[PDB]
Subunit: 36 residues, 3 copies
Amino acid sequence: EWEAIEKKIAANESKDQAIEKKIQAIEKKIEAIEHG
Amino acid sequence: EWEAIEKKIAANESKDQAIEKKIQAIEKKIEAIEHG
Amino acid sequence: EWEAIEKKIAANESKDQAIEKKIQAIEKKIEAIEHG
Ligand SMILES: [Tb+3]
Ligand SMILES: [Tb+3]
Ligand SMILES: [Tb+3]
Ligand SMILES: [Zn+2]
Ligand SMILES: [Zn+2]
Ligand SMILES: [Zn+2]
């Protein structure tokens, strides 16, 4: 159980980090729009 | 104790997945604005 | 590991909450950007 949960948590952090990257790319596109 | 942790983890995956759906919708709107 | 697991989960939750807040703000700004 300890290692099966450890693996689920590690996968969540990895996915939480890929979400963060997609958000930065979105913020940059928006930045570009707001500066004509 | 273990089953409560398992429930918290399943809830975290559900939220993380909803966020991913929303991000998909945002990308579509931003591309419509880019080149209308 | 019990309490260390719960500490990792608490961190995932606050991190996902911060992402939730940014999504709200981005969704508002996109509609405002579409308005004008
Ligand atoms: Tb998460
Ligand atoms: Tb179980
Ligand atoms: Tb505790
Ligand atoms: Zn372990
Ligand atoms: Zn291990
Ligand atoms: Zn506990």
